[PDB]
Amino acid sequence: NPTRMELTRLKKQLTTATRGHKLLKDKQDELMRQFILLIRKNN
Amino acid sequence: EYRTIKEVVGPLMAVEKVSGVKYEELIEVRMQNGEIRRGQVLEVQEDKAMVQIFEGTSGINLKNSSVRFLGHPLQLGVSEDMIGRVFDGLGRPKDNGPEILPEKYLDINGEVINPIARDYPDEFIQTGISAIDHLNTLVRGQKLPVFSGSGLPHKELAAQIARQATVLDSSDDFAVVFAAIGITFEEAEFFMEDFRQTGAIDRSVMFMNLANDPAIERIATPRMALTAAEYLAYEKGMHVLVIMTDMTNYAEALREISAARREVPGRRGYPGYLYTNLATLFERAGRIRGLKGSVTQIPILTMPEDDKTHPIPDLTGYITEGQIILTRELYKSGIQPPIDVLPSLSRLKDKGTGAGKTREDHAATMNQLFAAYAQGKQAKELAVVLGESALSDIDKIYAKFAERFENEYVNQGFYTNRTITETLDLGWELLAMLPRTELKRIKDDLLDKYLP
């Protein structure tokens, strides 16, 4: 398991996962704002 | 002559009753059947000396064999007649050509250049490869290595660069010294045949060392090649491009000798003095104040398990002024050459570019192409994570830019020779995909002159 090839690969997965986390968090926020406009109209 | 072989352990032998014997001195073994083998002193004490025989020790009877010490180490017989010739690791003719009468014999270790005697790299070298000439420019006197890996095409790239490299104007062209270290015959034959079929051999001196050649011959090879280069450059006033592959093979040869002397390894199994060793080779390069000729180096190495923190590429980068990186991702996508411009670097690039050297739009377009490429890769990733819904119209362009950049700009082919003008023009055609608003790193002065 703990080889240098695994290390470099897991370090790459972390960078990707970190970026994906930021993109998804932004998406949720963007959906939330649009929802706010719609939900007030719904009310 | 000595009939005093005491021990034989593999290709190594211990010889007693030695006197006046020097480290790295050449020896000659006369076997009991009259057969002659040569070797080199790897270690020497008062009573004895340790030697390694190039041809091995099979069939040797200790008692009835003899040893003679030649009184000199490996030396290169230099001459301008080396041009157009192919030699092995020890400088011996490989092409069955006419005899060479040396001007003189030189030691192959060279001398260390006074740091204040060096002149700064000035002249642009056109490799004919866009990803280098434009984004990671090679300048005359630089050391700019290629970091590759097993199964990556550094073989084709090495041949291409040696084939296409030239300086604009000048009239006098590049003499190319090509050193092959510990490579397979099949690869050595590719190089030799490519050089002959294109006429590049008429400009070149080749030192070819093979994988099944002795470790001491592999160690000698880079030193033979660089001794030839400094002679042509600093004594004959020639501009010399030195291409050496594979430096990793050189490093493995050092470990073999180091283990024979029972030396405890340093980091990751390599000798502690690996840095000194690599630095002594790679710093045999550059312009020298008051001298017409110069040495430019392109060392080539494979990174074990594609690991850039490995001692070989790690220490090399500390010594050389940048590195060109080949990647598996690009090669699997069919990009030729598979150069990844993002981690690639030339540290002297600003010295060989601009008006008078290349063209005035060189630096600006390089920064712009780099920015848009990284931005386009981010855009592609965004589309996979959040969908095509999240992409703006500008985002979809950057994604398309990065695609065309890899496929038309970087992917030029191993036999395509692009002039710097053609390279710069192609850069502008790709930047033309983007709105003028996005071209921020380019002043409107040059944007109005070149943007199609």
Judged by CB atoms closer than 8 Å, whether chains meet at B305 and A5 is answered as: yes
Chain A residues within an 8 Å CB radius of B386? 23-24, 27
Identify the CA nearest to B178 among candidates B135, B114, B240.
B240
Q: Which DSSP string corresponds to A1-43?
A: ---HHHHHHHHHHHHHHHHHHHHHHHHHHHHHHHHHHHHHHH-
**Residue B232's CATH number:** 3.40.50.12240
Inter-chain Cβ pairs, chain A and chain B, closer than 8 A: 20
Phi, psi of B145 (to 5 degrees): -90, 160
Number of domains in chain B: 1
Q: Are strands B204-210 and B174-183 parallel, antiparallel or unpaired?
A: parallel
Identify the CA nearest to B126 among candidates B170, B180, B83, B156.
B170
Neighbour tally for B341: CB within 10 Å: 24
Neighbour tally for B346: CB within 10 Å: 23
CA dist B31 → B6, B62, B306, B421 (Å):
14, 8, 45, 63
Distance in angstroms (rounded) separating the CA atoms of residues B275 and B314 = 10
Q: Cα distance from B387 to chain A (closest Cα, Å)?
A: 11
Is residue B347 within 8 Å of B320, Cβ to Cβ?
A: no
Identify the CA nearest to B124 among candidates B355, B446, B290.
B355
Q: Cα distance from A41 to chain B (closest Cα, Å)?
A: 24
Report the 3 state secondary structure along chain B.
CECCEEEEECCEEEEECCCCCCCCCEEEEECCCCCEEEEEEEEECCCEEEEEECCCCCCCCCCCCEEEECCCCCEEEECHHHCCEEEECCCCECCCCCCCCCCEEEECCCCCCCCCCEECCCCECECCCHHHHCCCCCECCCECCEEECCCCCHHHHHHHHHHHCECCCCCCCEEEEEEEEEECHHHHHHHHHHHHHHCHHHHEEEEEEECCCCHHHHHHHHHHHHHHHHHHHHHCCCEEEEEEECHHHHHHHHHHHHHHCCCCCCHHHCCCCHHHHHHHHHCCCEEECCCCCEEEEEEEEECHHHCCCCHHHHHHHHHCCEEEEECHHHHHCCCCCCECCCCCEECCHHHCCCCCCCCCCHHHHHHHHHHHHHHHHHHHHHHHHHCCCCCCHHHHHHHHHHHHHHHHHHCCCCCCCCCHHHHHHHHHHHHCCCCCCCCCCCCHHHHHHHCC
Cα three-residue angle B345-B349-B353, rounded to 5 degrees: 145
B440: burial class by Cβ within 10 Å (0-12, 13-18, 19+)? exposed
Identify the CA nearest to B146 among candidates B282, B277, B313.
B313
A8: closest chain B residue by CA: B307
Is residue B286 within 8 Å of B118, Cβ to Cβ?
A: yes
B279: burial class by Cβ within 10 Å (0-12, 13-18, 19+)? middle
Is residue B21 within 8 Å of B49, Cβ to Cβ?
A: yes
| Last residue before each gap in chain B (C to N over 2.5 A) | none
Which of B309, B386, B391, B392 has the highest number of chain A CBs within 10 A, making it the mutation to test binding with A? B386
Identify the CA nearest to B176 among candidates B135, B225, B120.
B225
A21: closest chain B residue by CA: B385
Judged by CB atoms closer than 8 Å, whether chains meet at A4 and B381 is answered as: no
Judged by CB atoms closer than 8 Å, whether chains meet at A27 and B390 is answered as: yes
Is residue B14 within 8 Å of B6, Cβ to Cβ?
A: yes
Phi, psi of B281 (to 5 degrees): -75, -55
Judged by CB atoms closer than 8 Å, whether chains meet at B385 and A5 is answered as: no
Way it was determined:
X-ray
CA dist B69 → B17, B39, B176, B240 (Å):
12, 9, 35, 35
Distance in angstroms (rounded) separating the CA atoms of residues B163 and B147 = 19
Distance in angstroms (rounded) separating the CA atoms of residues B101 and B81 = 9
Distance in angstroms (rounded) separating the CA atoms of residues B162 and B175 = 10
Distance in angstroms (rounded) separating the CA atoms of residues B396 and B381 = 11
Identify the CA nearest to B230 among candidates B243, B222, B240, B217.
B240
Is residue B208 within 8 Å of B86, Cβ to Cβ?
A: yes
Judged by CB atoms closer than 8 Å, whether chains meet at B385 and A4 is answered as: no
Judged by CB atoms closer than 8 Å, whether chains meet at B307 and A20 is answered as: no
Distance in angstroms (rounded) separating the CA atoms of residues B28 and A5 = 46
Verify cis geometry, omega within 30 degrees of 0, for the bond prior to B246. Answer: yes
Distance in angstroms (rounded) separating the CA atoms of residues B68 and B29 = 6
β-pair partners for B444 = none
Q: Cα distance from B260 to chain A (closest Cα, Å)?
A: 28
Distance in angstroms (rounded) separating the CA atoms of residues B187 and B156 = 10
Q: Which residue bears the tokens 């890996």?
A: B149
β-pair partners for B36 = B30
Sign of CA dihedral B87, B52, B247, B123: negative
Is residue B430 within 8 Å of B408, Cβ to Cβ?
A: yes
Q: Are strands B174-183 and B146-148 parallel, antiparallel or unpaired?
A: unpaired
Q: Are strands B294-302 and B146-148 parallel, antiparallel or unpaired?
A: parallel
Distance in angstroms (rounded) separating the CA atoms of residues B402 and B395 = 11
Nearest to B386 among A4, A16, A23 (CB): A23
A5: closest chain B residue by CA: B305
Chain B residues within an 8 Å CB radius of A4? 305, 307, 309
Chain B residues within an 8 Å CB radius of A23? 382, 385-386, 390
Range of the domain at B420: 1-452
Which of A3, A21, A23 has the highest number of chain B CBs within 10 A, making it the mutation to test binding with B? A23
Exposed e or buried b per residue across B375-389, where buried means at least 16 C-beta atoms within 10 angstroms of its C-beta: bbbbbbebbebbeee
